[PDB]
């Protein structure tokens, strides 16, 4: 439907997040990042960049643009992109949950593939696989399968 129980992961108000968040450490963000006025100001810039007319190959450009425009260290953006399986849509969801919950990476968030999530996918255990498909869905599941038979 138009509705999704994933909305609660996107719905986070950036005005309730004190800036800079405690989780936003110098080893993940450049000095420019700490000069955004609010969490909303950063979010609005992140949305602006992410919405660029990129082509699937141009991950190297996006990582550079995220570094220059939003002050996210290149290696952290690459780390994020790998865990999102390239889904630029779930990029604003990553930071809102990372900042609200003060955990990096956010553990139980649909679309944010943890290390333990990948270890569960590696095993052919139907119990672990049910828990994964209940977290991310069959769509993200087949996308993650397609992703690692390559990576």
């Amino acid at each position: 439907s138009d509705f999704s129980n994933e909305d609660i992961y996107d719905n986070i108000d950036p005005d309730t997040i004190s800036f800079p968040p405690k989780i936003a450490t110098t080893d993940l963000f450049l000095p420019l990042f700490f000069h955004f006025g609010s969490t909303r100001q950063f979010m609005d810039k992140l949305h602006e960049v992410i919405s660029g007319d990129y082509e699937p190959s141009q991950a190297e450009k996006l990582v550079q643009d995220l570094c220059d425009e939003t002050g996210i260290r290149k290696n952290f953006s690459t780390s994020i992109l790998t865990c999102l399986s390239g889904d630029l849509m779930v990029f604003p969801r990553y930071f809102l949950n990372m900042f609200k919950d003060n955990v990096n990476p956010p553990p139980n968030v649909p679309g944010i593939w943890t290390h333990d999530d990948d270890e569960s996918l590696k095993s052919n255990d139907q119990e672990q696989i049910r828990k994964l498909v209940k977290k991310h869905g069959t769509g993200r599941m087949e996308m993650r399968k397609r992703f690692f038979e390559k990576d």
């Binding site: 990129y54 082509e55 699937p56 141009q58 991950a59 190297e60 996006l62 990582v63 390239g86 630029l88």
Partner: peptide
């Protein structure tokens, strides 16, 4: 450079 070449983006509508 290695990961980024193989990594495919899912752009916005």
């Amino acid at each position: 450079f290695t990961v980024l070449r193989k990594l495919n983006l899912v752009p916005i509508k």
